[PDB]
Design a protein around this ligand. Structure first.
Ligand SMILES: COC(=O)[C@H](Cc1cccc(C(=N)N)c1)[C@@H](C)NC(=O)c1ccc(-c2cccc(CN)c2)cc1
Ligand SMILES: [Ca+2]
Length: 223
């Protein structure tokens, strides 16, 4: 997160860290055994880390659970990043409590202007690299589809939306990928891509989760 603030320990209880000996992507807990992340975060050997704040120190409240399977959307395209969503089933159910909790899926898509909270342990610099120890947060509005398509001509599909600030200085960034965009208590987006980070007229692009709610439900029901 570039230009954000320290969230405060366990104030985002649905945030997940995906770990393979180091943090590489975020995710969102949507019930006690399933996590939603981005398809381009896929790799084998994923350990899901719940209840995290400082990812480098064991502070208490962490739960480390192996992924038993990761389901990349069958139509994900790595060249366009269309359908950039993945489900991860945990080997064991998480213990839900005040510090580890799930986030609700949307019942409808959010409008332009809706304020959202984005969080993660990604890069805090738009120029070099600086990774935080603790979770960073950012409030950002959903932009209109015409401004989004003007910023990225030919690259925005109907499964994507832009959120952020066209003046630059505040954005998500590498390492935040797969993590949550929560608007009004509902998971509306997944951190997916952007051109650089926090650059002027190049906002963040996010997977539009409301287009995938019946796919998520049908897939979890059969697995
Ligand atoms: C430093 O810069 C970064 O980290 C970002 C990635 C990234 C990751 C997470 C969030 C954000 C963001 N800005 N919100 C950005 C870097 C590594 N990536 C890019 O430049 C980048 C990523 C995708 C495309 C791209 C997307 C769709 C189609 C095509 C045509 N084939 C290209 C173009 C540039
Ligand atoms: Ca920790």
């Amino acid at each position: 997160i570039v230009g954000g603030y320290t969230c405060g320990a366990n104030t985002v209880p649905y945030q997940v860290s995906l770990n393979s000996g180091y943090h590489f992507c975020g995710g969102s807990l949507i019930n006690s055994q399933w996590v939603v992340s981005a398809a381009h975060c896929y790799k084998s050997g994923i350990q899901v880390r719940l209840g995290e704040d400082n990812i480098n120190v064991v502070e208490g409240n962490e739960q480390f659970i192996s992924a038993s399977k990761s389901i990349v959307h069958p139509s994900y395209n790595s060249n366009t990043l269309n359908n950039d969503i993945m489900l991860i089933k945990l080997k064991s159910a998480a213990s839900l409590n005040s510090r580890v909790a799930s986030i609700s899926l949307p019942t409808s898509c959010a409008s332009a202007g809706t304020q959202c909270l984005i969080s993660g342990w990604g890069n805090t610099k738009s120029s070099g690299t600086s990774y935080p120890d603790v979770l960073k947060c950012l409030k950002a509005p959903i932009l209109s589809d015409s401004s989004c398509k003007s910023a990225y001509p030919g690259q925005i599909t109907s499964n994507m939306f832009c959120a952020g600030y066209l003046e630059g200085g505040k954005d998500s960034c590498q390492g935040d990928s797969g993590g949550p965009v929560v608007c009004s208590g509902k998971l509306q987006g997944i951190v997916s891509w952007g051109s650089g980070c926090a650059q002027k007229n190049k906002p963040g692009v996010y997977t539009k989760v409301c287009n995938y709610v019946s796919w998520i439900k049908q897939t979890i029901a059969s697995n």
